[PDB]
Protein backbone atom coordinates (compact mmCIF):
# COMPACT_ATOMS: atom_id res chain seq x y z
CA UNK A 1 0.00 0.00 0.00
CA UNK A 2 1.06 3.29 -0.68
CA UNK A 3 2.53 5.73 2.25
CA UNK A 4 -0.58 8.51 1.38
CA UNK A 5 -2.64 5.66 1.89
CA UNK A 6 -0.53 4.41 5.04
CA UNK A 7 -0.66 8.19 6.67
CA UNK A 8 -4.07 8.24 6.20
CA UNK A 9 -5.05 5.04 7.80
CA UNK A 10 -2.99 5.83 11.13
CA UNK A 11 -4.91 9.14 10.73
CA UNK A 12 -8.13 7.35 10.47
CA UNK A 13 -7.47 4.99 13.10
CA UNK A 14 -6.39 7.61 15.77
CA UNK A 15 -9.58 8.98 15.10
CA UNK A 16 -11.54 5.52 15.24
CA UNK A 17 -10.43 5.19 18.88
CA UNK A 18 -11.45 8.80 19.77
CA UNK A 19 -15.00 8.22 17.90
CA UNK A 20 -15.07 4.97 19.94
CA UNK A 21 -14.58 6.07 23.11
CA UNK A 22 -16.88 9.17 22.63
CA UNK A 23 -19.49 6.78 21.10
CA UNK A 24 -19.05 4.72 24.37
CA UNK A 25 -21.60 5.23 27.18
CA UNK A 26 -21.82 3.74 30.91
CA UNK A 27 -24.65 1.63 30.72
CA UNK A 28 -22.64 -1.88 31.55
CA UNK A 29 -25.41 -4.51 31.83
CA UNK A 30 -24.76 -8.20 32.42
CA UNK A 31 -25.69 -11.24 30.51
CA UNK A 32 -25.77 -15.21 31.31
CA UNK A 33 -24.00 -17.36 29.27
CA UNK A 34 -23.34 -21.48 29.84
CA UNK A 35 -19.68 -20.44 30.25
CA UNK A 36 -20.77 -17.42 32.52
CA UNK A 37 -22.03 -14.13 33.09
CA UNK A 38 -20.36 -11.58 30.57
CA UNK A 39 -20.59 -7.89 31.03
CA UNK A 40 -21.29 -5.52 27.52
CA UNK A 41 -21.84 -1.64 27.75
CA UNK A 42 -24.05 0.57 25.79
CA UNK A 43 -22.86 2.42 22.67
CA UNK A 44 -24.08 4.94 20.26
CA UNK A 45 -24.06 5.47 16.52
CA UNK A 46 -23.34 8.25 14.13
CA UNK A 47 -27.46 8.31 13.16
CA UNK A 48 -28.37 8.73 16.90
CA UNK A 49 -29.40 4.89 17.53
CA UNK A 50 -27.68 2.75 20.41
CA UNK A 51 -27.19 -0.70 20.81
CA UNK A 52 -25.81 -3.07 23.55
CA UNK A 53 -22.49 -4.67 22.36
CA UNK A 54 -20.59 -7.63 23.89
CA UNK A 55 -17.26 -8.61 22.73
CA UNK A 56 -14.44 -11.09 23.05
CA UNK A 57 -16.83 -13.95 24.42
CA UNK A 58 -14.59 -16.85 23.53
CA UNK A 59 -16.41 -20.06 22.10
CA UNK A 60 -13.26 -22.14 22.09
CA UNK A 61 -9.71 -22.31 24.09
CA UNK A 62 -7.55 -20.29 22.49
CA UNK A 63 -5.66 -22.28 20.18
CA UNK A 64 -1.91 -21.72 20.71
CA UNK A 65 0.98 -24.10 22.12
CA UNK A 66 0.15 -27.32 21.61
CA UNK A 67 -3.27 -26.45 20.44
CA UNK A 68 -1.70 -24.66 17.34
CA UNK A 69 -2.95 -26.58 14.15
CA UNK A 70 -5.69 -28.27 15.81
CA UNK A 71 -9.60 -28.34 15.96
CA UNK A 72 -10.83 -26.08 18.81
CA UNK A 73 -12.01 -27.53 22.18
CA UNK A 74 -14.85 -25.75 24.11
CA UNK A 75 -13.31 -22.87 26.31
CA UNK A 76 -13.13 -22.95 30.30
CA UNK A 77 -16.07 -21.37 32.21
CA UNK A 78 -15.17 -18.74 34.74
CA UNK A 79 -16.93 -17.88 38.28
CA UNK A 80 -17.54 -14.02 38.31
CA UNK A 81 -18.50 -11.38 35.33
CA UNK A 82 -16.43 -11.30 32.37
CA UNK A 83 -15.52 -8.02 30.81
CA UNK A 84 -16.71 -8.08 27.40
CA UNK A 85 -17.10 -4.22 27.14
CA UNK A 86 -13.93 -4.19 24.54
CA UNK A 87 -12.87 -6.23 21.63
CA UNK A 88 -9.87 -8.71 21.08
CA UNK A 89 -7.16 -9.39 18.91
CA UNK A 90 -7.68 -10.14 15.15
CA UNK A 91 -6.50 -13.78 13.86
CA UNK A 92 -2.42 -13.42 13.14
CA UNK A 93 -2.46 -11.88 9.33
CA UNK A 94 -0.50 -9.44 7.10
CA UNK A 95 -2.18 -6.00 7.30
CA UNK A 96 -3.46 -5.10 4.34
CA UNK A 97 -2.32 -1.63 4.79
CA UNK A 98 0.94 -1.83 6.66
CA UNK A 99 2.08 -4.54 5.26
CA UNK A 100 2.99 -6.10 8.97
CA UNK A 101 1.68 -8.93 11.13
CA UNK A 102 -0.86 -8.07 13.42
CA UNK A 103 -3.14 -9.50 15.40
CA UNK A 104 -2.57 -12.99 17.88
CA UNK A 105 -3.02 -16.55 18.33
CA UNK A 106 -6.05 -15.74 21.02
CA UNK A 107 -8.41 -15.15 18.64
CA UNK A 108 -11.14 -17.50 18.84
CA UNK A 109 -13.99 -14.97 19.88
CA UNK A 110 -17.63 -13.64 18.58
CA UNK A 111 -19.50 -9.99 19.18
CA UNK A 112 -23.13 -10.02 20.07
CA UNK A 113 -25.17 -6.70 19.62
CA UNK A 114 -28.79 -5.48 19.90
CA UNK A 115 -30.84 -2.66 20.53
CA UNK A 116 -32.49 -4.03 23.02
CA UNK A 117 -31.94 -7.11 25.56
CA UNK A 118 -34.89 -7.52 27.16
CA UNK A 119 -37.48 -7.69 23.69
CA UNK A 120 -41.10 -8.66 24.72
CA UNK A 121 -40.62 -10.83 21.27
CA UNK A 122 -37.44 -13.27 20.65
CA UNK A 123 -35.71 -11.69 17.49
CA UNK A 124 -33.75 -13.35 14.16
CA UNK A 125 -30.42 -13.73 15.04
CA UNK A 126 -27.78 -12.74 11.97
CA UNK A 127 -24.44 -14.44 12.32
CA UNK A 128 -21.55 -12.36 10.01
CA UNK A 129 -18.62 -14.57 9.21
CA UNK A 130 -15.85 -12.02 7.64
CA UNK A 131 -14.36 -12.81 4.30
CA UNK A 132 -10.76 -11.88 3.18
CA UNK A 133 -9.95 -15.11 1.41
CA UNK A 134 -9.28 -17.13 4.53
CA UNK A 135 -6.20 -14.90 5.52
CA UNK A 136 -7.66 -11.54 6.52
CA UNK A 137 -10.12 -10.26 8.34
CA UNK A 138 -11.43 -9.49 11.95
CA UNK A 139 -14.95 -8.43 13.78
CA UNK A 140 -13.52 -5.69 14.81
CA UNK A 141 -16.09 -2.48 14.85
CA UNK A 142 -13.97 -0.50 12.35
CA UNK A 143 -14.18 -2.33 9.69
CA UNK A 144 -17.53 -4.59 10.90
CA UNK A 145 -19.55 -2.27 12.73
CA UNK A 146 -23.11 -3.26 13.51
CA UNK A 147 -24.51 0.42 13.28
CA UNK A 148 -26.62 -0.28 10.60
CA UNK A 149 -28.37 -3.20 11.70
CA UNK A 150 -29.23 -2.31 14.94
CA UNK A 151 -31.95 0.18 13.72
CA UNK A 152 -33.82 -3.44 12.83
CA UNK A 153 -35.38 -5.68 15.84
CA UNK A 154 -32.53 -8.41 15.37
CA UNK A 155 -29.53 -9.82 17.21
CA UNK A 156 -26.35 -9.51 15.21
CA UNK A 157 -23.17 -11.81 15.73
CA UNK A 158 -19.76 -11.27 14.32
CA UNK A 159 -17.07 -13.92 14.75
CA UNK A 160 -13.58 -14.60 14.25
CA UNK A 161 -12.11 -17.45 13.06
CA UNK A 162 -8.03 -18.81 12.63
CA UNK A 163 -6.89 -17.44 9.58
CA UNK A 164 -3.96 -18.71 7.09
CA UNK A 165 -1.83 -22.00 7.87
CA UNK A 166 -2.59 -21.20 11.57
CA UNK A 167 -6.25 -21.71 10.21
CA UNK A 168 -5.51 -24.50 8.03
CA UNK A 169 -2.57 -26.18 7.78
CA UNK A 170 -3.23 -30.19 6.60
CA UNK A 171 -1.07 -32.74 7.20
CA UNK A 172 -1.66 -36.42 5.54
CA UNK A 173 -0.18 -38.45 8.71
CA UNK A 174 -3.13 -39.65 10.91
CA UNK A 175 -0.84 -39.90 13.91
CA UNK A 176 -0.33 -35.76 14.41
CA UNK A 177 -3.88 -35.02 14.40
CA UNK A 178 -3.66 -31.91 12.01
CA UNK A 179 -6.14 -33.37 9.59
CA UNK A 180 -7.27 -29.65 8.28
CA UNK A 181 -9.88 -27.09 8.18
CA UNK A 182 -8.97 -26.09 11.63
CA UNK A 183 -10.65 -22.24 10.59
CA UNK A 184 -13.55 -23.68 9.53
CA UNK A 185 -13.99 -26.14 12.71
CA UNK A 186 -13.63 -22.71 14.24
CA UNK A 187 -17.03 -21.50 12.85
CA UNK A 188 -18.38 -24.84 13.77
CA UNK A 189 -17.94 -24.19 17.54
CA UNK A 190 -18.90 -20.34 16.85
CA UNK A 191 -22.10 -21.32 15.97
CA UNK A 192 -22.59 -24.13 18.73
CA UNK A 193 -21.98 -21.16 20.64
CA UNK A 194 -24.87 -19.31 19.14
CA UNK A 195 -27.58 -21.53 19.20
CA UNK A 196 -27.62 -22.40 23.24
CA UNK A 197 -26.63 -18.51 24.03
CA UNK A 198 -28.46 -16.16 21.64
CA UNK A 199 -31.78 -17.06 24.26
CA UNK A 200 -29.61 -14.51 26.90
CA UNK A 201 -29.48 -11.98 24.00
CA UNK A 202 -33.31 -11.60 23.34
CA UNK A 203 -32.53 -14.06 20.47
CA UNK A 204 -34.61 -16.52 18.66
CA UNK A 205 -32.87 -19.81 19.04
CA UNK A 206 -35.00 -21.27 16.02
CA UNK A 207 -34.78 -18.17 14.07
CA UNK A 208 -31.11 -18.02 13.61
CA UNK A 209 -29.57 -16.85 9.63
CA UNK A 210 -25.81 -17.36 8.93
CA UNK A 211 -23.99 -15.31 5.53
CA UNK A 212 -20.81 -13.96 4.55
CA UNK A 213 -19.30 -12.27 1.58
CA UNK A 214 -16.36 -13.76 -0.23
CA UNK A 215 -14.55 -16.17 1.66
CA UNK A 216 -16.82 -15.56 4.55
CA UNK A 217 -19.72 -16.84 1.75
CA UNK A 218 -17.88 -19.63 1.36
CA UNK A 219 -17.86 -20.50 4.92
CA UNK A 220 -21.69 -20.05 5.07
CA UNK A 221 -21.76 -22.69 2.42
CA UNK A 222 -19.55 -24.56 4.67
CA UNK A 223 -21.42 -24.35 7.31
CA UNK A 224 -24.72 -25.77 5.33
CA UNK A 225 -22.95 -28.76 3.94
CA UNK A 226 -21.48 -30.17 6.90
CA UNK A 227 -23.19 -32.62 8.95
CA UNK A 228 -21.19 -30.96 12.44
CA UNK A 229 -23.76 -27.86 12.19
CA UNK A 230 -26.81 -30.17 10.76
CA UNK A 231 -30.21 -27.98 12.09
CA UNK A 232 -28.15 -25.06 14.18
CA UNK A 233 -29.72 -22.67 11.68
CA UNK A 234 -32.70 -21.82 9.45
CA UNK A 235 -31.41 -19.58 6.87
CA UNK A 236 -28.07 -18.99 4.44
CA UNK A 237 -27.02 -16.15 2.06
CA UNK A 238 -24.23 -16.56 0.46
CA UNK A 239 -22.88 -13.04 -0.97
CA UNK A 240 -20.23 -13.35 -3.54
CA UNK A 241 -18.76 -16.74 -2.86
CA UNK A 242 -19.80 -20.52 -2.29
CA UNK A 243 -17.74 -23.51 -1.57
CA UNK A 244 -16.96 -24.71 -5.11
CA UNK A 245 -15.69 -21.59 -6.20
CA UNK A 246 -12.00 -22.34 -7.18
CA UNK A 247 -10.24 -20.12 -4.40
CA UNK A 248 -12.54 -21.72 -1.76
CA UNK A 249 -10.92 -24.97 -1.51
CA UNK A 250 -7.41 -25.98 -2.38
CA UNK A 251 -5.41 -29.48 -1.53
CA UNK A 252 -2.25 -28.38 0.64
CA UNK A 253 -0.92 -31.00 2.15
CA UNK A 254 2.31 -31.36 0.47
CA UNK A 255 2.85 -27.11 1.48
CA UNK A 256 3.79 -27.66 5.09
CA UNK A 257 6.97 -28.77 4.51
CA UNK A 258 7.85 -25.86 2.04
CA UNK A 259 6.83 -23.22 4.46
CA UNK A 260 8.76 -24.86 6.87
CA UNK A 261 11.35 -24.68 4.19
CA UNK A 262 10.82 -20.89 3.96
CA UNK A 263 10.81 -20.49 7.45
CA UNK A 264 14.37 -22.09 8.24
CA UNK A 265 13.54 -25.36 8.84
CA UNK A 266 16.53 -28.22 8.55
CA UNK A 267 15.43 -31.70 7.73
CA UNK A 268 13.52 -33.76 5.29
CA UNK A 269 9.68 -33.89 4.23
CA UNK A 270 8.22 -36.24 6.93
CA UNK A 271 5.00 -34.51 8.41
CA UNK A 272 6.15 -35.20 11.77
CA UNK A 273 9.62 -33.65 11.70
CA UNK A 274 7.53 -30.35 9.31
CA UNK A 275 5.11 -30.11 12.29
CA UNK A 276 7.28 -29.86 15.33
CA UNK A 277 9.27 -27.26 13.15
CA UNK A 278 6.07 -25.45 12.59
CA UNK A 279 4.72 -25.87 16.14
CA UNK A 280 8.11 -23.97 17.83
CA UNK A 281 8.13 -21.23 14.77
CA UNK A 282 6.70 -17.64 15.60
CA UNK A 283 3.07 -17.63 14.58
CA UNK A 284 4.37 -13.84 12.71
CA UNK A 285 7.12 -15.50 10.97
CA UNK A 286 4.81 -17.95 9.53
CA UNK A 287 2.05 -15.60 8.55
CA UNK A 288 4.52 -13.37 6.74
CA UNK A 289 6.14 -15.80 4.80
CA UNK A 290 2.72 -17.44 3.39
CA UNK A 291 2.95 -15.03 0.36
CA UNK A 292 5.56 -17.21 -0.79
CA UNK A 293 4.47 -20.79 -0.65
CA UNK A 294 2.75 -21.08 -4.10
CA UNK A 295 5.26 -22.44 -6.60
CA UNK A 296 5.11 -20.30 -10.23
CA UNK A 297 2.90 -23.21 -11.39
CA UNK A 298 0.66 -22.89 -9.29
CA UNK A 299 -0.31 -19.63 -9.31
CA UNK A 300 -0.33 -19.75 -13.23
CA UNK A 301 -3.01 -22.90 -12.29
CA UNK A 302 -4.69 -20.15 -11.02
CA UNK A 303 -4.54 -21.24 -7.03
CA UNK A 304 -5.46 -18.72 -4.99
CA UNK A 305 -4.02 -18.86 -1.50
CA UNK A 306 -1.47 -21.93 -0.54
CA UNK A 307 -3.60 -22.79 2.77
CA UNK A 308 -7.16 -22.60 2.95
CA UNK A 309 -10.47 -25.38 3.15
CA UNK A 310 -9.52 -28.93 2.11
CA UNK A 311 -10.74 -32.25 1.67
CA UNK A 312 -9.21 -33.86 5.06
CA UNK A 313 -6.90 -36.70 4.42
CA UNK A 314 -8.76 -39.12 6.72
CA UNK A 315 -12.00 -38.64 9.49
CA UNK A 316 -11.50 -37.51 12.87
CA UNK A 317 -14.16 -36.61 15.75
CA UNK A 318 -14.46 -32.89 14.45
CA UNK A 319 -14.30 -33.35 11.19
CA UNK A 320 -15.70 -30.87 8.61
CA UNK A 321 -15.03 -31.56 5.10
CA UNK A 322 -14.80 -35.36 4.65
CA UNK A 323 -15.52 -35.03 0.40
CA UNK A 324 -14.90 -32.49 -2.31
CA UNK A 325 -17.61 -29.63 -1.62
CA UNK A 326 -18.97 -30.33 -4.71
CA UNK A 327 -19.82 -34.08 -3.51
CA UNK A 328 -21.10 -32.95 0.19
CA UNK A 329 -23.23 -30.76 -1.94
CA UNK A 330 -25.43 -34.37 -2.75
CA UNK A 331 -26.38 -34.86 1.21
CA UNK A 332 -26.09 -31.47 2.78
CA UNK A 333 -29.10 -30.88 5.20
CA UNK A 334 -28.52 -27.03 4.16
CA UNK A 335 -29.92 -27.30 0.60
CA UNK A 336 -33.55 -27.60 2.08
CA UNK A 337 -33.54 -24.46 4.35
CA UNK A 338 -34.12 -21.06 2.60
CA UNK A 339 -31.24 -19.65 0.84
CA UNK A 340 -30.61 -16.41 -0.68
CA UNK A 341 -27.51 -15.44 -3.21
CA UNK A 342 -25.85 -12.76 -5.09
CA UNK A 343 -22.88 -11.22 -6.83
CA UNK A 344 -22.10 -7.86 -7.52
CA UNK A 345 -22.33 -6.17 -11.05
CA UNK A 346 -18.61 -5.92 -11.89
CA UNK A 347 -16.88 -8.61 -9.33
CA UNK A 348 -14.12 -8.45 -11.65
CA UNK A 349 -13.64 -4.84 -11.11
CA UNK A 350 -11.36 -6.17 -7.95
CA UNK A 351 -8.40 -7.18 -9.86
CA UNK A 352 -7.46 -3.50 -11.08
CA UNK A 353 -4.40 -3.35 -8.37
CA UNK A 354 -3.51 -7.28 -9.93
CA UNK A 355 -3.40 -5.65 -13.21
CA UNK A 356 -1.47 -2.83 -12.70
CA UNK A 357 1.35 -4.79 -10.95
CA UNK A 358 1.49 -7.48 -13.70
CA UNK A 359 -0.22 -6.03 -17.15
CA UNK A 360 1.43 -9.30 -18.99
CA UNK A 361 -1.65 -10.83 -17.33
CA UNK A 362 -3.72 -9.72 -19.66
CA UNK A 363 -1.96 -11.76 -22.54
CA UNK A 364 -3.70 -14.83 -20.87
CA UNK A 365 -6.66 -13.65 -22.83
CA UNK A 366 -4.73 -14.30 -26.01
CA UNK A 367 -6.23 -18.12 -25.39
CA UNK A 368 -7.66 -17.90 -22.26
CA UNK A 369 -5.76 -21.40 -21.57
CA UNK A 370 -4.89 -20.56 -17.72
CA UNK A 371 -8.79 -20.26 -16.82
CA UNK A 372 -10.19 -23.06 -17.96
CA UNK A 373 -11.19 -25.16 -14.86
CA UNK A 374 -8.26 -26.96 -13.58
CA UNK A 375 -10.14 -30.32 -13.16
CA UNK A 376 -10.49 -29.91 -17.04
CA UNK A 377 -7.27 -28.41 -18.10
CA UNK A 378 -3.83 -30.64 -18.86
CA UNK A 379 -0.91 -30.03 -16.30
CA UNK A 380 1.14 -27.66 -18.70
CA UNK A 381 -2.13 -26.31 -20.17
CA UNK A 382 -1.10 -26.92 -23.68
CA UNK A 383 -3.53 -30.04 -24.48
CA UNK A 384 -5.53 -28.92 -27.59
CA UNK A 385 -8.21 -30.09 -25.89
CA UNK A 386 -7.57 -26.79 -23.50
CA UNK A 387 -6.91 -25.16 -26.22
CA UNK A 388 -10.42 -25.16 -27.52
CA UNK A 389 -11.92 -25.41 -23.96
CA UNK A 390 -9.86 -21.89 -23.53
CA UNK A 391 -11.69 -20.66 -27.12
CA UNK A 392 -14.63 -21.08 -25.59
CA UNK A 393 -13.83 -18.42 -22.66
CA UNK A 394 -11.78 -16.31 -25.37
CA UNK A 395 -15.08 -15.35 -27.07
CA UNK A 396 -16.95 -14.75 -24.31
CA UNK A 397 -15.02 -11.69 -22.90
CA UNK A 398 -12.53 -10.92 -25.53
CA UNK A 399 -14.29 -7.94 -27.82
CA UNK A 400 -11.79 -6.96 -30.33
CA UNK A 401 -9.01 -8.39 -31.70
CA UNK A 402 -6.50 -7.86 -28.94
CA UNK A 403 -7.88 -8.66 -25.46
CA UNK A 404 -8.30 -5.42 -22.95
CA UNK A 405 -8.03 -5.02 -18.99
CA UNK A 406 -11.79 -4.86 -18.69
CA UNK A 407 -11.82 -7.96 -20.52
CA UNK A 408 -9.96 -10.03 -18.29
CA UNK A 409 -11.51 -7.88 -15.43
CA UNK A 410 -15.13 -9.66 -16.60
CA UNK A 411 -13.62 -12.97 -17.44
CA UNK A 412 -12.26 -13.05 -13.46
CA UNK A 413 -16.40 -12.16 -12.52
CA UNK A 414 -17.24 -15.32 -13.88
CA UNK A 415 -14.07 -17.57 -13.20
CA UNK A 416 -13.88 -16.69 -9.61
CA UNK A 417 -18.00 -15.94 -8.75
CA UNK A 418 -20.87 -16.24 -11.72
CA UNK A 419 -19.92 -19.67 -13.29
CA UNK A 420 -19.45 -21.32 -9.59
CA UNK A 421 -22.36 -19.89 -8.55
CA UNK A 422 -24.19 -21.98 -11.72
CA UNK A 423 -22.65 -24.89 -11.25
CA UNK A 424 -23.84 -25.05 -7.13
CA UNK A 425 -27.62 -24.03 -8.63
CA UNK A 426 -27.74 -26.62 -10.77
CA UNK A 427 -25.99 -29.47 -8.26
CA UNK A 428 -27.92 -28.40 -5.61
CA UNK A 429 -31.79 -28.85 -7.32
CA UNK A 430 -30.69 -32.79 -7.79
CA UNK A 431 -30.87 -32.88 -4.13
CA UNK A 432 -33.03 -30.40 -2.36
CA UNK A 433 -36.59 -30.80 -0.91
CA UNK A 434 -37.53 -27.37 -2.60
CA UNK A 435 -37.17 -24.68 -0.44
CA UNK A 436 -36.39 -21.65 -2.15
CA UNK A 437 -33.32 -19.82 -3.20
CA UNK A 438 -33.77 -16.31 -4.26
CA UNK A 439 -30.87 -14.52 -6.61
CA UNK A 440 -30.07 -10.35 -5.95
CA UNK A 441 -27.52 -8.39 -8.31
CA UNK A 442 -25.80 -5.54 -6.54
CA UNK A 443 -25.84 -3.21 -8.71
CA UNK A 444 -25.60 0.27 -6.71
CA UNK A 445 -22.30 2.51 -7.55
CA UNK A 446 -21.38 5.24 -5.12
CA UNK A 447 -17.92 6.95 -3.83
CA UNK A 448 -19.71 9.22 -1.29
CA UNK A 449 -19.59 6.10 1.25
CA UNK A 450 -16.86 3.79 1.01
CA UNK A 451 -14.91 0.74 2.51
CA UNK A 452 -11.64 0.05 3.34
CA UNK A 453 -11.22 -2.71 0.77
CA UNK A 454 -11.30 0.12 -2.00
CA UNK A 455 -7.82 0.77 -0.68
CA UNK A 456 -6.64 -2.66 -1.36
CA UNK A 457 -8.20 -3.15 -4.42
CA UNK A 458 -6.83 0.46 -5.92
CA UNK A 459 -10.66 1.52 -6.33
CA UNK A 460 -10.12 5.32 -5.79
CA UNK A 461 -11.96 7.11 -8.70
CA UNK A 462 -12.46 4.06 -10.83
CA UNK A 463 -16.20 3.39 -11.37
CA UNK A 464 -18.29 0.19 -11.47
CA UNK A 465 -19.45 -2.21 -8.39
CA UNK A 466 -16.65 -4.42 -7.26
CA UNK A 467 -16.24 -7.48 -5.11
CA UNK A 468 -17.31 -5.96 -1.49
CA UNK A 469 -18.94 -2.73 -2.46
CA UNK A 470 -21.77 -3.87 -0.98
CA UNK A 471 -20.01 -4.06 2.83
CA UNK A 472 -20.32 -0.27 2.32
CA UNK A 473 -24.27 -0.44 2.83
CA UNK A 474 -24.08 -3.38 5.54
CA UNK A 475 -21.41 -2.63 7.94
CA UNK A 476 -20.52 1.15 9.36
CA UNK A 477 -16.51 1.15 9.00
CA UNK A 478 -13.91 3.59 10.01
CA UNK A 479 -13.98 5.32 6.55
CA UNK A 480 -18.07 5.83 7.16
CA UNK A 481 -19.62 9.21 7.70
CA UNK A 482 -23.64 9.98 8.55
CA UNK A 483 -24.99 10.23 5.23
CA UNK A 484 -27.99 12.52 5.00
CA UNK A 485 -31.55 10.72 5.17
CA UNK A 486 -32.57 11.49 1.71
CA UNK A 487 -29.15 10.27 -0.08
CA UNK A 488 -29.03 7.49 -2.80
CA UNK A 489 -26.43 5.72 0.09
CA UNK A 490 -28.40 6.18 3.16
CA UNK A 491 -31.80 4.97 0.94
CA UNK A 492 -29.35 1.63 -0.07
CA UNK A 493 -28.22 1.10 4.04
CA UNK A 494 -32.25 0.96 4.57
CA UNK A 495 -32.72 -1.67 1.40
CA UNK A 496 -29.86 -3.76 2.30
CA UNK A 497 -30.18 -4.17 5.42
CA UNK A 498 -34.34 -4.16 5.45
CA UNK A 499 -34.43 -6.98 3.01
CA UNK A 500 -31.37 -9.00 4.91
CA UNK A 501 -33.59 -8.67 7.84
CA UNK A 502 -37.01 -9.51 5.73
CA UNK A 503 -34.91 -12.46 4.47
CA UNK A 504 -33.75 -13.51 8.18
CA UNK A 505 -37.16 -13.41 9.79
CA UNK A 506 -38.96 -15.55 6.83
CA UNK A 507 -37.14 -16.97 4.60
CA UNK A 508 -38.51 -14.83 2.23
CA UNK A 509 -36.37 -11.26 1.16
CA UNK A 510 -39.32 -9.59 -0.17
CA UNK A 511 -41.27 -7.13 1.81
CA UNK A 512 -43.67 -3.78 0.72
CA UNK A 513 -42.36 -2.31 4.11
CA UNK A 514 -39.14 -1.65 1.70
CA UNK A 515 -38.87 1.69 -0.39
CA UNK A 516 -38.42 0.85 -3.70
CA UNK A 517 -39.98 -2.49 -3.60
CA UNK A 518 -43.86 -1.60 -4.24
CA UNK A 519 -43.40 -3.43 -8.16
CA UNK A 520 -41.17 -6.20 -6.92
CA UNK A 521 -42.24 -9.78 -7.90
CA UNK A 522 -38.88 -11.49 -6.65
CA UNK A 523 -39.57 -15.91 -7.05
CA UNK A 524 -37.12 -18.19 -6.41
CA UNK A 525 -35.32 -19.95 -8.91
CA UNK A 526 -36.57 -23.33 -10.04
CA UNK A 527 -35.12 -26.29 -11.59
CA UNK A 528 -36.87 -25.95 -14.83
CA UNK A 529 -35.69 -22.60 -15.55
CA UNK A 530 -33.24 -22.12 -18.24
CA UNK A 531 -32.64 -18.51 -17.18
CA UNK A 532 -31.76 -17.06 -13.40
CA UNK A 533 -34.14 -14.03 -12.62
CA UNK A 534 -32.71 -11.71 -9.44
CA UNK A 535 -33.54 -8.93 -7.75
CA UNK A 536 -31.33 -5.99 -9.12
CA UNK A 537 -30.35 -4.00 -6.66
CA UNK A 538 -29.16 -0.25 -8.02
CA UNK A 539 -30.73 3.39 -7.35
CA UNK A 540 -33.83 1.50 -8.42
CA UNK A 541 -34.77 -2.26 -7.54
CA UNK A 542 -36.10 -4.36 -10.38
CA UNK A 543 -36.35 -7.87 -11.14
CA UNK A 544 -34.50 -8.86 -14.26
CA UNK A 545 -33.12 -12.06 -15.98
CA UNK A 546 -28.96 -12.40 -14.79
CA UNK A 547 -27.20 -10.19 -17.38
CA UNK A 548 -24.49 -12.76 -16.79
CA UNK A 549 -26.51 -15.70 -18.44
CA UNK A 550 -25.18 -15.82 -21.39
CA UNK A 551 -21.24 -15.67 -20.37
CA UNK A 552 -22.37 -18.31 -17.92
CA UNK A 553 -23.56 -20.75 -20.29
CA UNK A 554 -20.47 -20.27 -22.63
CA UNK A 555 -18.63 -21.56 -19.65
CA UNK A 556 -20.64 -24.63 -19.02
CA UNK A 557 -20.26 -25.65 -22.73
CA UNK A 558 -16.66 -26.37 -21.91
CA UNK A 559 -18.18 -29.34 -20.39
CA UNK A 560 -20.08 -30.52 -23.11
CA UNK A 561 -17.99 -33.68 -23.16
CA UNK A 562 -17.44 -33.99 -19.67
CA UNK A 563 -21.01 -33.47 -18.13
CA UNK A 564 -19.93 -36.09 -15.04
CA UNK A 565 -18.06 -32.87 -13.85
CA UNK A 566 -20.25 -30.60 -14.21
Not at 34 to 62: N, W
Not at 213 to 237: D, K, N, P, V
Not at 487 to 497: A, F, G, L
Not at 515 to 536: F, H, Q, R
Request: proline share 5%; hydrophobic share 35%.
Amino acid sequence: VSLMEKLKWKIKCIENKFLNYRLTTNETVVAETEYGKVKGVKRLTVYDDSYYSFEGIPYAQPPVGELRFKAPQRPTPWDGVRDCCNHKDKSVQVDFITGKVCGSEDCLYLSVYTNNLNPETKRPVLVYIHGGGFIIGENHRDMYGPDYFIKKDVVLINIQYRLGALGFLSLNSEDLNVPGNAGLKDQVMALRWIKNNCANFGGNPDNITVFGESAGAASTHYMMLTEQTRGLFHRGILMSGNAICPWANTQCQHRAFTLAKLAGYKGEDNDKDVLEFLMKAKPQDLIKLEEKVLTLEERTNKVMFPFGPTVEPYQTADCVLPKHPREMVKTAWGNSIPTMMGNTSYEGLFFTSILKQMPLLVKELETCVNFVPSELADAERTAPETLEMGAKIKKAHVTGETPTADNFMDLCSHFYFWFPMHRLLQLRFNHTSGTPVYLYRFDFDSEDLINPYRIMRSGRGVKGVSHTDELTYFFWNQLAKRMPKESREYKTIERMTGIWTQFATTGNPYSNEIEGMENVSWDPIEKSDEVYKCLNISDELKMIDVPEMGKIKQWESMFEKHRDLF
